[PDB]
Structure 1
Amino acid sequence: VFRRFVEVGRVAYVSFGPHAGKLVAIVDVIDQNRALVDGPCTQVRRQAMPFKCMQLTDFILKFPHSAHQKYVRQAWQKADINTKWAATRWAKKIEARERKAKMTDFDRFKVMKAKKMRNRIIKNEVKKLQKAALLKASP
Structure 2
Amino acid sequence: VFRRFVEVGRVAYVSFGPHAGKLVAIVDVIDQNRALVDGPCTQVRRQAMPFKCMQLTDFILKFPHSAHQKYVRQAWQKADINTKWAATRWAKKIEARERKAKMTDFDRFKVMKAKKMRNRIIKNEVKKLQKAALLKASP
Q: TM-score range by the shorter chain?
A: over 0.9
Per-residue deviation, 1:79: 1.8
State the secondary structure of the residue aligned to 2:35.
strand
Q: Deviations over 1:6-47 (max 9, x none)?
A: 000000000000000000000000000000000000000000
TM-score using structure 1 length: 0.99
Structure 1 outlier segments of 4+, above 4 Å: none
State the secondary structure of the residue aligned to 1:114.
helix
Per-residue deviation, 1:118: 0.3
TM-score using structure 2 length: 0.99
Distance in 1 between the 2:107 and 2:138 partners?
50
Q: Deviations over 1:70-117 (max 9, x none)?
A: 000000000210000000000000000000000000000000000000
Structure 2 gaps of 5+ residues are none
Structure 1 gaps of 5+ residues are none
Distance in 1 between the 2:7 and 2:41 partners?
19
Quick one: percent identity of the two aligned structures?
100
Per-residue deviation, 1:135: 0.8
Alignment of 1:98 with 2:107, yes or no, is no
Distance in 1 between the 2:41 and 2:79 partners?
11
State the secondary structure of the residue aligned to 1:79.
coil
State the secondary structure of the residue aligned to 2:73.
helix
